[PDB]
């Protein structure tokens, strides 16, 4: 069958991947008692966009649900699936003659059918008449709430949809649940994205020199991922935190655009990834800017390495993800106590939520077509209203096929530390005189991507992780663009 | 005063640049008979966006009119200017404490006042109260039509604006006209963007190899502009057309994503640039993939080079830009005839609009904060309804301070050639027996950025252009 490919050593992704997803969605919908026979799934692709009122085009990236079902890269398309048969039909725009001058070849309907291995291809302006001729029960459209953004999914619509019976409640929870569980074909892509990004992280560690700007490493990472990986997009805005910036979880945005000079003695926290064909990776490496851990840096870093490996070692089907978050908290507190930053009963620290002072974010999240993938809080799965845990992007139990990030971290965040020092329930645990040394330290985060198996997990990421390994990697005398 | 800077060898941009723009706008509005005393210009900045319904953040780039006036990089801001006094007030979001954990330090209002050198800073939620305090005659908001996209500019709005008198017709043509004419400080930035982009084009020519994918060069170009120039964003989607893809003017979009393998004998057309601090550059270099021009490639290229230099040599204040487009058409037809592709009277070719077959786009466009900058077609300036000329992005007369691209090109586009061969008014001019050899050639585009001066132009771009210069640059020669 046909496959998506950018040549060179990039991965060939079979379009059968998306046919399997369409089939899995139909199989699940058929088992839903509320689903009438003759139902048709209707999805609307993304459209081209420009900057504000200008004609400056924004690079198009397909909507995730639509890509999951069809894998279509072209803007302005629709896609429908007959639930009972699973028959797929892709609607493409009818392009004007001038498209041949400015944009490129005007491909046939037959070309798209062969390209995407769908059952039929029609023009977008025909969608109402085509659907009418098919005598459908009900049009199943996408509407639901993304539990990370709070946004409502955009329901498909076309002129003449008035005429149909539309249900916009059934589909979202079912297609979400399908996306939660990755097929072996999806997993082959996620292995690939992790490979390229792992290689790019290694190159960054090799290249980093005191005096460079953080964004120089962002540029190198993205250049490796694009030129060698075909990853034209980044799965998110790259986070290149040097020094105290490594305590800023989502550093690198426009308000704080990776513009700090890397100084001798800094800890680097590089949380960056790209996507290949809308499939994500999410990896974070922490390392000393000058290639040699100090004693304090080693202690903080190896505390996070310990929680990382303890969580991965415990992960298997049936494990409650909040329990893993709480395991990482307890480990961090134990290590911080060993360092002398903390004193007293770790049990009491945990009862007082002291772990969230040092890790205010969730231990990890689902990963897939979106870096913060869907399905973390389906109906009946509630968010825990406790420090740290409330930032978890899922409170679910692990099952085979789920793809998770494991990204424990320890950070020295002034306003969270100051809050704790003012709370008598937590101040007694903290040793101000030792902690003062760690103000401005920043933080360490170690992020791995894993797949839940029948017996445990499969690690997708392959980067240096121990102190010895990182120091060996950064000292490696051996990718020189220009 | 304070300056924008990304360190290393990047350009320090003084915030005085934007203060001057604010000054120029007030001076122009004070002379507008429709403007009454006590008027306040109100602009709304861009906001953060995400991918569809996800929480995947989109890299924020400021709206261009707002940037021109204030140069603010943060999302969620408003900006207002008192016309009579020129007093500027920046409105910044009131951030939650959570921001200190996830996004970074919560800067004080005084921090932003210092950073942007504005007269006052307030929080966005206080805009209604602050403006009511000032007792304005009218609020001058932004609404108009962009003549390249056809979009309507987003007019500023806030809770309680209904209580004010709002005019949305006066500002747009005036702030557009200010943007048409670049101050000396703006030119310093456009000189820098051209510098970096030119260097990146040189590096690409040095690095191209047969067998590479087009997007490998896109990646290298962006990496140079960002790592060495601080051009985090690119000014538009890079166009890396190899072979017949060089006949596609806006190749490289999602539908045609620079994924062709570069083959021996191919002509490369690389139309790619970046922006620094929302200031654009627009450069195109054409060159043979294997580093050596064939005879045919030399002929097509030097035809475009001749038109390029003819236009640049003729550009000066008072010149009508469509005349420069027709000048390029005539030179193209002359040289295509000299190559044996065409035969007959060039006068007759021009009268038949044959030039548009080979250059179906406009000769060049205004450049500034947007690659296709504003002000090309103000009221009274009409689009010429003829092939080629109708694609011009401005029909204005050149004046000092204008910044334009000069990007003639020659392409071999089958459906346009076939249309001409079926047209008796044009068919006799084309020699099939020679044209057959150039089918699938692609095309050549040579794009320079220039500033109109009192004497002529200042050329901002600095890349190799002659056949000998290009072959030398791709052989790694220092220059
Ligand atoms: O947003 C999240 O959930 C993770 C935590 C650190 C940055 N990314
Ligand atoms: O859009 C325009 O006007 C020019 C023509 C070639 C590509 N850019
Ligand atoms: Mn993550
Ligand atoms: Mn241009
Ligand atoms: Na992360
Ligand atoms: Na151009």
Protein residue with its CA nearest to atom 3 in ligand 2: B362
Atom of ligand 1 nearest to the CA of A393: 3
CA angle (A287, A291, A293) in 5-degree steps: 65
Pair type for strands A13-14 and A3-4: antiparallel
Q: Which of A272, A194, A283 is nearest to A238 (CA)?
A: A272
Protein residue with its CA nearest to atom 8 in ligand 2: B249
A326 Cβ below 6 A of ligand 1: no
Q: Is A133 an 8 Å CB contact of chain B?
A: no
CA of A346 to the centre of ligand 5 (A): 27
Rounded to a whole number of angstroms, the distance from the CA of A135 to the nearest CA of chain B is: 31
CA of A373 to the centre of ligand 3 (A): 10
Taking CA–CA distances from B388, the nearest residue in chain A reads A101
Using CA atoms, how far apart are residues A112 and A72, in angstroms rounded to an integer? 9
How many other C-beta atoms can be found within 10 angstroms of the C-beta atom of residue A384? 14
Chain A interface, best mutation among B204, B223, B246, B248, by max A CB count within 10 A: B223
DSSP 3-state of A411: strand
Under a CB-based contact definition with an 8 Å cutoff, are residues A116 and A107 in contact?
no
Rounded to a whole number of angstroms, the distance from the CA of A232 to the nearest CA of chain B is: 8
CA of A409 to the centre of ligand 1 (A): 10
Q: Is B46 an 8 Å CB contact of chain A?
A: yes
Nearest bound ligand to the CA of residue A409:
1
Domain segments of chain A as ranges:
3-180, 184-475
Using CA atoms, how far apart are residues B337 and B350, in angstroms rounded to an integer? 12
DSSP 3-state of A41: strand
B254–A56 CB contact, under 8 Å: no
* Domain B184-474 grouped into CATH 3.90.230.10: yes
Q: Which of B102, B111, B175, B165 is nearest to B135 (CA)?
A: B165
Chain A interface, best mutation among B51, B199, B245, by max A CB count within 10 A: B51
Site to probe by mutation for ligand 2, drawn from B147, B256, B361 as the one with most ligand atoms within 8 Å of Cβ, is: B361
A236–B73 CB contact, under 8 Å: no
Pair type for strands B88-92 and B120-123: parallel
CA of B193 to the centre of ligand 2 (A): 19
Rounded to a whole number of angstroms, the distance from the CA of B455 to the nearest CA of chain A is: 31
Written as six digits, the tokens of A102 are 């400015």
Under a CB-based contact definition with an 8 Å cutoff, are residues B379 and B173 in contact?
yes
Using CA atoms, how far apart are residues B270 and B268, in angstroms rounded to an integer? 6
Cβ contacts of B455 within 8 Å, gap of 6 or more: B316
Q: SS3 sequence, A254-321?
A: CCCCCCCECCCCCEEEEECCEEECCECCCCEEEEECCCCCCHHHHHHHHHHHHHHHHHHHHCCCCCEH
Q: Within chain A, what is the greatest distance between any pair of CA atoms?
A: 77
A260 Cβ below 6 A of ligand 1: no
- DSSP for residue B369: S
Site to probe by mutation for ligand 1, drawn from A361, A377, A390 as the one with most ligand atoms within 8 Å of Cβ, is: A361
Q: Is A9 an 8 Å CB contact of chain B?
A: no
- Confirm or deny that B347 is annotated as ligand binding: no
Under a CB-based contact definition with an 8 Å cutoff, are residues B38 and B133 in contact?
no
CA of A237 to the centre of ligand 5 (A): 11
Pick the CATH number of A184-475 from 3.40.50.920, 3.30.70.890, 3.90.76.10, 3.90.230.10: 3.90.230.10
Report residues near ion ligand 6: CB below 5 Å.
B 271, 407, 447
Using CA atoms, how far apart are residues A82 and A88, in angstroms rounded to an integer? 7
Match 């400021």 to its residue by tokens: B62
Using CA atoms, how far apart are residues B297 and B435, in angstroms rounded to an integer? 13
CA of B28 to the centre of ligand 4 (A): 29
How many other C-beta atoms can be found within 10 angstroms of the C-beta atom of residue B269? 28
CA of B409 to the centre of ligand 2 (A): 10
DSSP 3-state of B20: helix
Rounded to a whole number of angstroms, the distance from the CA of B136 to the nearest CA of chain A is: 28
B-chain residues near A75 (CB < 8 A): 254-255
Q: Which neighbouring-strand residues pair with A88? A: A81
Atom of ligand 1 nearest to the CA of A364: 3
A204 vs A227, A234, A322, A460, B36, CA distance in Å? 15, 16, 33, 19, 58
Q: Which of B48, B203, B251 lies at the smallest CB-CB distance from A482? A: B203
Q: Is A437 an 8 Å CB contact of chain B?
A: no
Q: Is A259 an 8 Å CB contact of chain B?
A: yes
CA of B282 to the centre of ligand 6 (A): 6
Q: Within chain B, what is the greatest distance between any pair of CA atoms?
A: 77
Under a CB-based contact definition with an 8 Å cutoff, are residues A123 and B270 in contact?
no
A422 vs A416, A419, A430, A432, B473, CA distance in Å? 10, 5, 11, 12, 65
Site to probe by mutation for ligand 2, drawn from B237, B271, B328, B376 as the one with most ligand atoms within 8 Å of Cβ, is: B271
Q: Where are the alpha helices (DSSP H) in A344-478?
A: 346-351, 355-358, 414-422, 424-427, 432-435, 467-475
CA of B180 to the centre of ligand 1 (A): 43
Taking CA–CA distances from A226, the nearest residue in chain B reads B219
Using CA atoms, how far apart are residues B196 and B204, in angstroms rounded to an integer? 12
Under a CB-based contact definition with an 8 Å cutoff, are residues A200 and A224 in contact?
yes
B249–A151 CB contact, under 8 Å: no
Cβ contacts of A140 within 8 Å, gap of 6 or more: A29, A35, A39, A40, A41, A42, A83, A167, A168, A170, A171
Q: Which of B155, B160, B156, B157 is nearest to B128 (CA)?
A: B160
A-chain residues near B391 (CB < 8 A): none
Match 């590479």 to its residue by tokens: B212
A227–B219 CB contact, under 8 Å: yes
Helices (H), strands (E): how many in chain A? 16, 20
Nearest bound ligand to the CA of residue B148:
2
Check the CA dihedral B359-B360-B363-B367 and report its sign. negative
B250–A6 CB contact, under 8 Å: no
A-chain residues near B255 (CB < 8 A): 73-75, 103-104
Burial class (CB in 10 A: 0-12, 13-18, 19+), B334: middle
Phi, psi dihedral angles at B366 (to 5 degrees): -60, 150
Structure-solving method: X-ray
Written as six digits, the tokens of B130 are 């602050």
Under a CB-based contact definition with an 8 Å cutoff, are residues A27 and A125 in contact?
no
DSSP 3-state of B422: coil
Q: SS3 sequence, B120-167?
A: EEEEHHHHHHHHHHHCCCCEECCCCECCCCCCECCCCCCCCHHHCCEE
B212 vs A12, A482, B223, CA distance in Å? 18, 15, 17
A6 vs A9, A53, A327, CA distance in Å? 8, 33, 42
Protein residue with its CA nearest to atom 3 in ligand 1: A362
B223–A219 CB contact, under 8 Å: yes
Atom of ligand 2 nearest to the CA of B361: 5
Under a CB-based contact definition with an 8 Å cutoff, are residues A121 and A90 in contact?
yes
Rounded to a whole number of angstroms, the distance from the CA of B135 to the nearest CA of chain A is: 31
- Confirm or deny that B372 is annotated as ligand binding: yes
Taking CA–CA distances from A102, the nearest residue in chain B reads B249
Rounded to a whole number of angstroms, the distance from the CA of A96 to the nearest CA of chain B is: 13
Q: What is the DSSP string of B347-363?
A: HHHHHTTTHHHH--S-S
A249 Cβ below 6 A of ligand 1: yes
- DSSP for residue A33: T
A361 Cβ below 6 A of ligand 1: yes
H or E stretch including B44?
A: strand B40-44
Spacing of C-alpha B374 from chain mean position: 9
User: At the top level of CATH, which class does the domain A3-180 belong to?
Assistant: alpha beta
Q: Is A427 an 8 Å CB contact of chain B?
A: no
Site to probe by mutation for ligand 1, drawn from A240, A247, A250, A448 as the one with most ligand atoms within 8 Å of Cβ, is: A250
Q: Where are the alpha helices (DSSP H) in B4-83?
A: 16-30, 64-70
């Amino acid at each position: 069958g046909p496959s998506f490919w950018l040549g060179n050593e990039t991965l060939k992704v079979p379009l059968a991947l998306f046919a399997l997803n369409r089939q899995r969605l139909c199989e699940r919908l058929r088992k839903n008692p509320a689903v009438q026979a003759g139902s048709i799934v209707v999805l609307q692709g993304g459209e081209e966009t420009q900057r504000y009122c200008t004609d400056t085009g924004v690079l198009f990236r397909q909507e995730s649900f639509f890509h999951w079902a069809f894998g279509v890269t072209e803007p302005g398309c629709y896609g429908v699936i007959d639930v009972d048969t699973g028959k797929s039909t892709l609607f493409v725009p009818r392009l004007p003659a001038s498209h041949a001058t400015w944009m490129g070849k005007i491909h046939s309907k037959e070309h798209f059918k062969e390209k995407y291995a769908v059952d039929d291809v029609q023009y977008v302006d025909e969608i109402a008449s085509v659907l009418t001729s098919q005598k459908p029960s009900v049009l199943l459209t996408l509407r639901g709430v993304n539990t990370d953004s709070g946004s409502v999914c955009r329901e498909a619509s076309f002129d003449g949809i008035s005429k149909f019976e539309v249900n916009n409640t059934i589909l979202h929870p079912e297609i979400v649940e399908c996306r939660v569980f990755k097929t072996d074909m999806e997993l082959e892509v996620l292995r690939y994205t992790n490979k390229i990004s792992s290689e790019a992280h290694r190159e960054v560690m090799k290249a980093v020199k005191v005096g460079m700007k953080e964004y120089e490493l962002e540029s190198l990472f993205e250049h490796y991922c694009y030129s060698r990986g075909g990853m034209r997009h980044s799965s998110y805005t790259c986070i290149c935190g040097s020094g105290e910036n490594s305590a800023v979880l989502h550093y690198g945005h426009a308000g704080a655009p990776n513009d700090r000079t890397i100084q001798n003695g800094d800890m680097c926290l590089f949380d960056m990834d790209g996507e290949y064909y809308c499939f994500a990776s999410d990896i974070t490496c922490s390392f000393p800017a000058n290639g040699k851990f100090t004693a304090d840096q080693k202690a903080v870093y190896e505390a996070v390495l310990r929680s990382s490996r303890a969580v991965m070692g415990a992960m298997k089907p049936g494990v409650w993800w909040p329990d893993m978050h709480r395991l990482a908290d307890r480990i961090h507190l134990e290590e911080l106590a060993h360092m002398g930053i903390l004193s007293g009963s770790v049990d009491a620290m945990v009862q007082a939520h002291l772990g969230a002072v040092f890790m205010p974010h969730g231990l990890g999240h689902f990963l897939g077509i979106d870096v913060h993938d869907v399905g973390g809080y389906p109906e009946g799965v509630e968010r825990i209203d406790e420090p740290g845990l409330r930032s978890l992007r899922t409170a679910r139990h692990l099952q085979p096929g789920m793809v998770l990030t494991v990204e424990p971290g320890i950070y020295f965040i002034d306003h969270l530390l100051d809050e704790a020092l003012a709370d008598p329930a937590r101040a007694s645990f903290l040793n101000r005189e030792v902690l003062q040394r760690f103000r401005g330290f920043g933080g360490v985060r170690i992020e791995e991507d894993v797949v839940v198996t029948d017996s445990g997990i499969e690690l997708l990421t392959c980067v240096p992780r121990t102190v010895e390994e990182i120091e060996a990697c950064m000292a490696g005398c051996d990718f020189t663009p220009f």
